[PDB]
Structure formats: C-alpha cells, structure tokens
C-alpha cells in the first residue's frame, strides 16, 4: 500500500514536470516571435539612420558650391 502511494506521488510529479516543459516550449515559441519582430523594428530604425547620413552628405555637397 505504501509503495502504491509513493508511485502515485511520482506520477503526479512527473506529469507536473511535463506540463512545465511544454508550457516553457510554448513560451519559447512566443519569445522567438517577439525576437523576430523586434529585430525587424530595429532594422527599420537603422535603415532610417543610414538614410539620413546620405541626405546630410548630399546637403553638404550642395552647400559647398
């Protein structure tokens, strides 16, 4: 009887571990999604940053004359 009790406890514990595992896996999918989205936003920002340098260079070229 005691051995069956501890067996049931072990089953509950391992199912808790499994549910934590797949919850973490779904959280991983989520965080990877935000990682892609945020790199995209930062790439747009740095593209705008690089665009300004060319415009200011052109302004300097036109102001030299």
């Amino acid at each position: 009887v005691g051995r069956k009790e501890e067996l049931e406890a072990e089953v509950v514990e391992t199912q808790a571990a499994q549910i934590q595992l797949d919850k973490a896996a779904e959280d991983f999918r989520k965080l990877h999604v935000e990682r892609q989205d945020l790199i995209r936003q930062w790439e747009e920002a740095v593209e705008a940053m690089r665009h300004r340098d060319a415009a200011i260079a052109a302004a300097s070229e036109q102001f030299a004359m």
Partner: peptide
Amino acid sequence: KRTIQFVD
C-alpha cells in the same frame, strides 16, 4: 506563471 498552461 510556469505551472498552468492555458488552452491555445
């Protein structure tokens, strides 16, 4: 929390 997972 990491213990409960909601339905998708």
